[PDB]
Write a protein that binds this DNA or RNA. Sequence first.
RNA 1: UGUGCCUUA
Length: 400
Amino acid sequence: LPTWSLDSNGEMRSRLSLSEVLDSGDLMKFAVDKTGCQFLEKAVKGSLTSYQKFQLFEQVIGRKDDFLKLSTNIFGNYLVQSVIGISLATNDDGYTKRQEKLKNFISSQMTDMCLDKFACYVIQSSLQNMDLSLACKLVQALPRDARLIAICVDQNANHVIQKVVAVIPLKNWEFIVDFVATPEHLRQICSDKYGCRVVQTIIEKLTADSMNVDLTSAAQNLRERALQRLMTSVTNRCQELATNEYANYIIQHIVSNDDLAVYRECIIEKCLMRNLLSLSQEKFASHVVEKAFLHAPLELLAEMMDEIFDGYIPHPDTGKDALDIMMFHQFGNYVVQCMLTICCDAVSGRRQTKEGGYDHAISFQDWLKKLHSRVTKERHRLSRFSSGKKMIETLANLRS
RNA sequence: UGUGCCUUA
C-alpha cells in the first residue's frame, strides 16, 4: 500500500479517512490488502455522503477490469459485495445505469466468475439482492454446453446453481432442468459429490410441498411439468443411480418424500422389485432398499415382503434362502432389521396400518410371525452378531 | 457390523 498511508514503522496509519483513500486513486491497493480492505469494509458500513458513494461506485463497480480484479480477490470480493449493496440502496439518477452496468459486467464473464473461488460469492449475492428483472439476466448468461456440467460439479460453483434455484423463478432456469435431464448429463452430474446435491436441490424446489404454496396455479403447472420431465429421466436410469456412491442419495430422497409419492412408486417398480435380494447386498443400494421398505404404499410393501419371504428359490444343496443370506450379510442384515422394526412398529401401534380402505394389521402380524419364527430357530447363530442380538432384543421388547 | 456435499478475510 501507498507510502502516504503508512506511519514510521511501515504500518497503515490509524486516523485514515475514507475520503483520503477515495481521493488518492489508490483504492485498488487497499482493497487487495488484508488490513486495507478491513479498513474499507468498516468505513463503508458507516454514514456515507453522496460523493463518497459516487466514488465507490466508480472505483469498485464502475470499470469492468477493476470490478473483475476485486471480485476474484480473496479480500476484494467482500468490498465488491458491500458496494453492490450500497448501489442498490441509493436511488439517485445514476441507479439504473449502475445496475445495468453491473449486469453487463457479470453476464459477460459469467462462467469464469462462477468457477472462481471468490467471485462466486459476488454472483450469489447479486442473484438474491439485485432487482429481480436484472438478476434474471444473470441466469440467462449461464452457459448451455459442457461448461454447465463443470459448474454443477464444481466445489464452488455448485452453490451458484443452488442460489439460482433458491431465489429466481423457475421459468428462468427451466433450461437447467432440461440440461440435467439429458441422459449423459444426468449420469455425470448425479454421480458427482457436488452434482448430486445440486440435483437434490432442484428436485426439492420442483416439489409441490408446503414451501411452494405461494406459487400461482400457472406456476404450479410449470413446476409440475418440469418435475415430470426430470423424474422421467431419473426413473429411466434408476438402477444405475440407486447403486452409485453419490446418486443413491437422490433416489433415497425421492423414495422417502411423501410429496413425491407417485415417483416413489415408479422407482420401486422400475428398479427395486424383483431385485431386492441383490440390491440389499450392495453397499450403496442397500440404503435405498431400506427407504423403500420404510415408505412404500402398503400394497407395494406387501409385494416387497412377499419377495423376501417367498420370491427366491433356496440353495439347491444347503437350503439356505434369501432371508438366511440377508440376515448374515454385511449390508443385507440392516435391511432385515428394517423389515422387523417396521412390523414391530405396526403391531405396536406406532405405525398406521390403515391404507387403501382397509386395515392391513393382519399382514404385518403375518410378516412379524415369519421373522419371529426365523429368529427363534436361528437364535444361536444370530446371537454371534450385533445385528442378530439387536433383532432378538427388538422381539423381546415387543413382548413386554 | 454399512455411504456424500453444505464451499471465502
